[PDB]
């Protein structure tokens, strides 16, 4: 705990003044939990760029199953695999995918409009809207979406540094869940197959470029990015339009606007917090050199609040400089994320419908969180459209 009490529900409503005293007295601070955790945004780039830590040789703990996707891989199984999804998430591949994400969200805004104007943005709209896209994308109909919303979140708290016993569990039988329903999934493919992902993965399969469990687990790893941050960008946006009328404004009347205010909502509240790597040489960080098999925390989050690369880093503003296109919200390096493009793009469809149909949206009542240390998380969220 101490500088960073990862389960004290203050911090976990509010990290950021943590973050911002680590920056200052412990730009490499040995956490108790045996991470040495990484504040500055200058040292957290250059790090998520090192070819040398290593995703592949931490223990994932009950979250081991991450080891049999590119998330969980070092190179060269990790260009192995992600060269295989590659050609899914580029733009073109994102033009398609934009055009299902629009008919559901405009389906939904339909219901609303026709209705009382009232809903949960989070379950009713980002969830929704984002998971559909996801199903759309692998060739399935949507089915257990709670289940499987409720599972990401469950192994999430594994994830985080913080993680208990119990949460191990819950995350093993998780696990288990998953590997069942996408066995599931994919028995019914090759049964009957279509032109999905879930085809190309089975199809790579057979052509011996991945296991059988690759195949599985890196269903469930789409699963999980395909609705957990993009879900936390469309709440937190739809949250500031209510608060911040002009950025409602700004984003229907400006479109060379939209860009900077994805960015600036992703820097000022970043989804995930951290990345973990594991260094295999002496590593040189500022004043400290960190031995090799040292767990490092790179704070995504804090890098994004570092006052040396973003002025009056606390304040929001959608203004700044070069669209406030720096920050590392969607990581960097090797493991960069995969579905920045598709993520960009279905932020944006939420969010021009809205602003392209309603005069405004306001709260409809008080939001509902479950924020841990790894993923800031909004899980109910009632608003009412005019
Ligand atoms: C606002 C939304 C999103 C944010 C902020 C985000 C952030 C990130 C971050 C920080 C990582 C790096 C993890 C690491 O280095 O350990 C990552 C990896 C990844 N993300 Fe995203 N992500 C988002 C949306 C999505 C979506 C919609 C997809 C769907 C394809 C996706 C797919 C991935 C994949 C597959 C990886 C692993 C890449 C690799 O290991 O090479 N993400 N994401
Ligand atoms: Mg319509």
């Known amino acids: ?35 040495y955790v990484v504040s500055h945004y200058e040292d957290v780039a250059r790090l998520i760029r090192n070819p040398s830590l290593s995703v592949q040789q931490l223990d994932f703990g009950p979250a ?26 580029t733009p073109k591949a994102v033009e398609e995918w934009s055009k299902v994400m629009r008919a559901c969200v405009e389906a939904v805004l339909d219901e609303v409009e026709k209705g009382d104007g009232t809903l949960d943005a989070a379950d009713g709209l980002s969830l929704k809207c984002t998971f559909e896209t996801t199903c759309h994308i692998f060739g399935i109909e949507p089915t257990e979406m709670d289940a499987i919303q409720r599972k990401t979140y469950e192994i999430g708290l594994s994830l985080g540094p913080g993680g208990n ?55 469930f790893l789409f699963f999980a990015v395909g609705h957990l941050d993009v879900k936390h ?32 909502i992703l820097r000022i509240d970043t989804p995930e917090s951290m990345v973990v790597r594991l260094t295999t040489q002496d590593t040189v960080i500022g004043d400290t050199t960190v031995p090799a098999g040292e767990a490092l925390a790179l ?10 690369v973003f002025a009056d880093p606390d304040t929001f503003d959608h203004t700044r400089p070069l669209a406030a296109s720096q920050h590392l919200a969607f990581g960097s390096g090797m493991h960069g994320c995969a579905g920045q493009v598709l993520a960009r793009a279905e932020a ?7 602003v392209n149909r309603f005069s405004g949206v306001e709260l409809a ?19 009412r459209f005019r």
Do not use: C
Not at 64 to 87: E, V
Not at 242 to 259: G, H, I, N, S
């Open 1 to 35: 705990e101490d500088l960073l009490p990862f389960r004290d529900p203050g911090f976990r409503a509010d990290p950021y003044p943590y973050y911002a005293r680590l920056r200052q007295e412990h730009p490499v601070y040995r956490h108790p939990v045996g991470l």
């Open 64 to 89: 081991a199953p991450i080891h049999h996707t590119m998330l969980g891989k070092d190179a060269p199984d990790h260009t192995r695999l992600r060269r295989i999804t590659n050609r899914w998430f």
């Open 165 to 219: 016993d119990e949460e191990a569990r819950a995350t093993t039988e998780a696990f288990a869940w998953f590997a069942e329903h996408i066995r599931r999934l994919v028995a019914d493919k090759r049964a009957r197959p279509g032109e999905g992902l879930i085809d190309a993965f089975i199809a790579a399969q057979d052509e011996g470029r991945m296991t059988e469990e690759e195949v599985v687990y890196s269903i």
């Open 233 to 264: 960008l469309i709440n937190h946006g739809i949250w500031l339009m209510t608060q911040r009328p002009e950025l409602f404004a700004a984003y229907r009347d400006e479109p060379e606007a939209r860009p900077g205010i994805i960015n600036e």
């Open 299 to 308: 704070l995504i989050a804090s890098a994004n609040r570092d006052p040396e």
């Open 348 to 354: 944006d469809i939420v969010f021009s419908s809205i």
């Open 365 to 383: 009542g008080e939001p509902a969180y479950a924020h841990t240390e790894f993923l800031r998380t909004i899980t109910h969220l009632p608003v």
